[PDB]
Design a binder for this molecule. Structure first.
Ligand SMILES: Cc1ncc(COP(=O)(O)O)c(C=O)c1O
Lengths: 446, 440
């Protein structure tokens, strides 16, 4: 098709999109289709002549929609929020026109990482605006980022021990290397240790599911005693399981003095640190060698955006593609800092709403302190009761919740995710959960 | 911003984008601004209140455009891998709104069938209810080559162990050999290193095609030296020139010698939707796997690389975009698209044959012309250097044998023979100046 025809149809698709979004509340979030429903609906071969746009869009409604998961539904309460903003869509559009994989890309990235750095109020050591030795950079995921960090640290320690002891071979050194994370850390850490070919050990967390000084130091002594070599440690701010926070201020100086590279994975919670109410949870970065979080989670930049800063950017070269700063730029300019702060606080509020609806009911309990946007709750009593509860919910198909385990407790996770969630939805949700609970607790007397 | 702001600014962006594409002829293909230009044009910190859309798009022209490459220019005469058609942009827009997905798994299966029939692969390769064999979208062609090689590795190991229970996997692998043309895309070499097997190049003939004589030789030399051939990559539309391995001669030898025959159609594979070109693909019946990237010529986004196997046992929502592109051009549209480009190629080819200073190195079949200035390597390097220096068009070189070469690829959506005329005349001029200098 020619330019002029894209105009008619692009604008049409813009309308089609807006509609889908405006009416999204109406859709059953999860698909109920029987395998192989699709093939009969689509012809055996490609068409010789072009089809009409009318026919194709109809077909998107009739054929594709029924078979897709609508995660932008405000009724999606699983995992963590996944960024989808209209400003990013507009960027993707432009970005599709230009194409990408020169200087505007690299430069807007550096400057955007500086914008974001100033927002999270990071130590100047991570910022390269005033000529600093460190800087920011966009990765595809927290996981990739953690890997990039593990491998920079690996390279580092090798270059150190070899400088001080030339006779020493790479193979012989990596045999000894040990890395760390909290027992609450994310799989991406294990992934990294295996790719990086080193040993990974978990530190036991405390009753707030946080890594502390004493526990980390036990570990280190234990492994140094056996001749192993600490080189890398990941600290999680906003664990996947229950949004708990490693004690960065306790752990930072330890890592420093033990010549252990400290990476802070803040993939979800990191977004909230642009609000002064939450910035303190980040106190400690001072000590970190690298810091990462996912704007494509809670900062409205559409997927593929992961933000990482390092104290020494040449440390990073040791590890040896797209135009993502454009999205960031659009999102930041189209919302402003204030608007972003509001986005965050609106979720946090709604999470506290749900929280206090649960407390208020003598039958339930909160399991972890509710810090920001995730609620870990439970029906008082047996696990089995709560596995029963989650079944009912997940079977009813109105909402969907993801259980986790906290030591020995089975726990239900409610997560404020979507861009358009209001107080109304959260309430509707809690109704549904509470009907189903009473049902369960009544089938408990039989 | 809310949904009705987006109905407005979204349609506005549709306009900005179309304008962009339409006037693209006029833009210089390469930035003429230095790393460092951007920071001072843009404030030091993010704004507190929302900026206006109007000020943002103005900033895109004034600030972003000078700093950007413009690979969608007709004057970009190489393969732009992240190039996209309009139907693809329409798809992306929807894909954004949407974002465990039964529709995306199943559409992909049907699209692979569509592509399949378009290329008219033998019935075997079809996943269309036949049972045996089938097709899959791999990440990239490198990833495909590696998948075939692993499948092939596994096959030979089982084969040899059934015959000789004593042989160990390790003892076997140490002796395995893989082959490909000496024009084999780099991604064969990588697949071998990861598969931990020996890779040897088969020398091509006067046409840069792999032939029986050369294949048999290597199988003889290596079998006798106690090695075991197990895998080969035949290339259809090489990445240096636009060469074509002879499947008719190579195929039968593979089947006989138990060599697994993977065909790498690369970029060229798309041309086989046209009857004129299907003869270059005769031989696939012998092949065990077949791969190509439809991005190049079937106007998709390159997240896509199609691969089929004769036997399936031996082994992001992409499908939507495919569906949109195929549904929106039609087969005939797609065909006209390849055909136009081939035509532009033969037109550039003429201009080249019509100047005695230049030669043509490889038969021009598809959208690529390999030519140079008659004479010396030195000379040509100098000509390429000053073409890129002028930044008005872009070309990439390659080495065929021992000889530097200029590749002219007609690849963009908007290319017309005017752009070709204008580019050739540009290439003549700087060749004059280059020739002069050489005399000194
Ligand atoms: C002949 C050939 N094989 C393999 C490849 C690799 O393609 P991809 O980058 O999609 O893996 C290319 C593309 O550049 C090619 O031209």
């Amino acid at each position: 098709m020619n330019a002029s025809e894209f105009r008619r149809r692009g604008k049409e698709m813009v309308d089609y999109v807006a509609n889908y979004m405006e009416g999204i509340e109406g859709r059953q979030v999860y698909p109920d289709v029987e395998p192989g429903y699709l093939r009969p609906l689509i012809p055996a071969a490609a068409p010789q002549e072009p089809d009409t746009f009318e026919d194709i869009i109809n077909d998107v409604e009739k054929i594709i929609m029924p078979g897709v998961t609508h995660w932008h539904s405000p009724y999606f309460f699983a995992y963590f929020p996944t960024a989808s903003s209209y400003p990013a869509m507009l960027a993707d559009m432009l970005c599709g026109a230009i194409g990408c994989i020169s200087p505007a890309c690299t430069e807007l990235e550096t400057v955007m990482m500086d914008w974001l750095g100033k927002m999270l109020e990071l130590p100047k050591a991570f910022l390269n605006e005033k000529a600093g030795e460190g800087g920011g950079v966009i990765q595809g995921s927290a996981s990739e980022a953690t890997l990039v960090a593990l491998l920079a640290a690996r390279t580092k320690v090798i270059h150190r021990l070899q400088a001080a002891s030339p006779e020493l071979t790479q193979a012989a050194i990596m045999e000894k290397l040990v890395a760390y994370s909290s027992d609450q850390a994310h799989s991406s850490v294990e992934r990294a240790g295996l790719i990086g070919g080193v040993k990974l050990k978990a530190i036991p967390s405390d009753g707030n599911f946080a890594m502390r000084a004493s526990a980390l130091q036990e570990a280190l002594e234990r492994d140094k005693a056996a001749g192993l070599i600490p080189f890398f440690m990941v600290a999680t701010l906003g664990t996947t399981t229950c949004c708990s926070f490693d004690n960065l201020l306790e752990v930072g100086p330890i890592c420093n003095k033990e010549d252990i590279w400290l990476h802070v994975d803040a993939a979800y919670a990191g977004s909230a640190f642009i609000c002064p109410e939450f910035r303190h949870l980040l106190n400690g970065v001072e000590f970190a060698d690298s810091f990462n979080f996912n704007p494509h989670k809670w900062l409205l930049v559409n997927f593929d955006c992961s933000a990482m800063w390092v104290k020494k950017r040449t440390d990073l070269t040791g590890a040896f593609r797209r135009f993502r700063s454009l999205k960031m730029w659009f999102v930041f300019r189209m919302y402003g800092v204030k608007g972003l702060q509001a986005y965050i606080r609106k979720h946090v509020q709604l999470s506290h709403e749900f929280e206090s609806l649960v407390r208020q009911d003598p039958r339930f309990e909160i399991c972890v302190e509710v810090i920001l946007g995730l609620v870990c709750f439970r029906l008082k009593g047996s696990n089995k009761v709560n596995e029963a509860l989650l079944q009912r919910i997940n079977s009813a198909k109105k909402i969907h919740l993801v259980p986790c385990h906290l030591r020995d407790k089975f726990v239900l996770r409610f997560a404020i995710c979507s861009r358009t969630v209001e107080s109304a939805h959260v309430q509707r949700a809690w109704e549904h959960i509470k009907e189903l609970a009473a049902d369960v607790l009544r089938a408990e007397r039989e």
